[PDB]
């Protein structure tokens, strides 16, 4: 008979040096780490986008209720939970003429009108940022739904501007990298979710029970993009530096141009936990292969180590590299070339797709989350998704597929690696959640990859995650 072990709860630190396990109530009862002053917002778009954004900012400061409060916590207001006022008074509105909008949705080609839209938004943003006496905190982007809906990559409307990407968000985020402006991209469908209906009398998707998490998620992401931190960890020990690595492909190009991006947990000596993406995209000319060349991987690891040392003062003993693919011999040689003298390296491979479904004998609820099945000394299943005793509900719907955490190379302890991986599932600032089904060290790198893919000429890339998330 085979045995199962349990991994202790990670817990997360909050204001006043308190501790808890759930991020939402850790913020609600105790507050965020720092204290902000205010947030200033500016809408780019039509007057309709202005109206929608003002309505959303008025709704965020007010209490939000659902049918049953057991499933999700309620929203009491952004200022009350973050201790900083942010409403529709510190606003800078930039018009977008409908006449200019109409003149671009006519070429029937996605490339030209997409590039024209990106330019017509970025020029207004830069003009407002430069030639105005106000100082907006976070620049907000509102996009009409139908125009982008017709801007799909493999779609048509029923050469200077033709050799570019066929997507809006990616190129738009890639073109604001050299300006270092915190820009947040909203589709009109998200915020104006109440003014869109159908000819049936009932919504297609039941959004009446996810309003609270929508509000929490957008508020946390915005507050992060304002320069504040909602929470951090309680037991980040010295010698810990998590580093991510995700692969992406550029699709429409002469060469396959495999795109690999990195993200990095580490300490900033301010008694906090600062997440910055020390990422400048590394290109793999070979087709189909998902292995960095020695040069690019060596550069990635050297940049991570230098960032840590210049951030803290000494090279950490241990480095964790969470990857979605396995490693080769020369790649590990490249990572070992810049490894400090008295240090060791661990590479965790997380193969998401593997068939293993477990059944409880009596109950219809799935396996408990923090369970761990030790196949061997260098292999284990960790149910990053599972039943949560804190909220008594199920994170996933169907039977979860446990992640296959393999210590691909190096020597470590399976218990410690699994505990650290479980801990890293709460440090996202996009959505204020309980725990993530995938480590954020393997997801924020992917979001970086999808952001900084549409263009490759950018020099001096942004560091913080306010820009990309």
């Amino acid at each position: 008979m085979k045995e199962l072990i349990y991994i202790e709860e990670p817990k997360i630190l909050f204001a006043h040096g308190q501790k808890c396990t759930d991020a939402r109530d850790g913020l609600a009862l105790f507050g965020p780490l720092n204290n902000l002053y205010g947030i200033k917002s500016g809408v780019i778009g039509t007057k309709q986008g202005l109206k929608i954004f003002r309505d959303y900012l008025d709704h965020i400061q007010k209490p939000i209720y659902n049918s049953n409060s057991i499933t999700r916590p309620m929203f009491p207001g952004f200022e009350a939970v973050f201790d900083c006022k942010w409403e529709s008074t510190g606003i800078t509105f930039k018009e977008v003429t409908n006449e200019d909008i109409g003149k671009f949705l006519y070429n029937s080609s996605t490339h030209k009108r997409t590039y024209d839209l990106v330019s017509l938004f970025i020029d207004k943003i830069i003009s407002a940022n430069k030639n105005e006496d106000e100082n907006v905190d976070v620049w907000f982007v509102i996009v009409p739904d139908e125009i982008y809906k017709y801007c799909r990559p493999n779609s048509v409307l029923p050469a200077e501007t033709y050799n570019y990407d066929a997507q809006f968000h990616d190129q738009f985020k890639a073109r604001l990298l050299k300006h270092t402006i915190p820009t947040q991209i909203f589709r009109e469908s998200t915020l104006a979710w109440r003014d869109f209906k159908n000819a049936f009398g009932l919504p297609i998707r039941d959004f009446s029970k996810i309003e609270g998490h929508l509000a929490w998620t957008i508020s946390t992401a915005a507050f992060y993009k304002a320069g504040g931190k909602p929470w951090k960890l309680s037991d980040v020990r010295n010698g810990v530096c998590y580093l991510g690595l995700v692969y992406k492909k550029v699709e429409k190009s002469k060469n396959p141009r495999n795109a690999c991006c990195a993200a990095q947990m580490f300490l900033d000596n301010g008694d906090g936990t600062v997440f910055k993406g020390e990422v400048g995209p590394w290109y793999n000319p070979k087709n189909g292969q998902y292995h960095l060349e020695p040069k690019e991987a060596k550069a990635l690891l050297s940049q991570s180590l230098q960032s840590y040392k210049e951030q803290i003062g000494e090279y950490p003993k241990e480095v964790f590299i969470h990857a979605k693919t396995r490693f080769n011999h020369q790649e590990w040689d490249a990572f070992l070339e810049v490894t400090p003298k008295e240090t060791n390296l661990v590479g965790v491979t997380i193969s998401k797709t593997k068939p293993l479904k477990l059944y409880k004998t009596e109950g219809d609820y799935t396996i408990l989350r923090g369970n761990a099945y030790v196949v061997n000394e260098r292999s284990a299943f960790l149910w990053t998704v599972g039943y949560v005793p804190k909220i008594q509900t199920a994170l996933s719907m169907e039977v979860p597929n446990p992640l296959f955490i393999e210590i691909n190379k190096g020597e470590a302890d399976i218990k410690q690696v699994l505990k650290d991986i479980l801990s890293l599932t709460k440090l996202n600032y996009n959505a204020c959640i309980f725990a993530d089904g995938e480590p954020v060290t393997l997801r924020f790198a992917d979001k970086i990859g999808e952001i900084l893919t549409a263009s490759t000429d950018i020099k001096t890339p942004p560091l913080a995650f306010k820009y990309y998330i």
Binding site: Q61, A80, Y359, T361, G363, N376, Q392
Partner: protein, 372 residues
Amino acid sequence: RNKIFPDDNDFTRWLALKLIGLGYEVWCDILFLDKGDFWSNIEKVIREDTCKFLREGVLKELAVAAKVKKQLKMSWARGLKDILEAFEKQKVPKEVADASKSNLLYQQIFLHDKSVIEKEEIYDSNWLSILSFPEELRFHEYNWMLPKRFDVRELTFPAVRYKNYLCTFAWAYDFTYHLPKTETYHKSKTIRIPTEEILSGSYDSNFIRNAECKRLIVQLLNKAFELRMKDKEVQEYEMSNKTAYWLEKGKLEKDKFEKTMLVGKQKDKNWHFAISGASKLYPFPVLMISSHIFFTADGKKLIDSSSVQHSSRRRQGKNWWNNTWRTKLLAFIKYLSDDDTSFYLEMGSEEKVFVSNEPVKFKGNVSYNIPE
């Protein structure tokens, strides 16, 4: 002394927690979960150590407050500020403020019946245990005695080409019908290798590599699984990269096997549970059975619209729970069992590979109380 006396449940919760957080003592019924001395204490507090106070019951409380007074002779931020100003102006006493008490009360009250129970549990799995293997791995030297386009996968016995050999678990003189020139075969030129050393990892030879040998054996296992599924009058679906084997309609007894429903009807359309065989030798020999749901029109002919397949699968998978997945998997596995405890894969005239019908059982240490 030193104490101060269902539509707004969370509002009251947050208000009380915040008032405690700023150092204002709040007494409420949400502290003591147990009920049944519940009113006498309140009356004693009102009569003895109550100085200032901040439906039939509401009327009675209002009357009590009036008697006490006679005897004495937008947003929530504005409300919170007004409450704080009123408390400060009235000079309501307070002690040293701390959040440790609030954290402890939250830990010991909010998540009382949501804790960890140290109880061992047993879980099933989708891995079918493998019992035994035939005594040898057979390689047949079929030199210039078979057609070059003979298409080895058309045979009734599982075999796959390798260099100039043929690998199978059958005798050297099987399937002579499809390959007529078989009789003049010398038996001393057939390579036999025992399964134990090659599978456990004790076979290093130039003829075949261990990873290659494992790939060959799992190919034979998948091919024989396909042949067995064809043998049991079970239709097939050619998936995106693999093959799935789905029972027909009316094959079972009242569409039920061992008190389990595997094929059924949805609206005016028929759905069919299916399985996919993929044997792997890591960590230990198993015969993985992934689960799928396909939809057809009349129950026998597949529908040629992948979008319809995905939409129907996602619509059906919303209502499925752990019990249903377990029951369907175990019933489908038991339906292919032979006699009592295992079903063989017909990989030979008299030689078979035994794979047990009971999936591997996992044992745990910590359980979850599943409180209804």
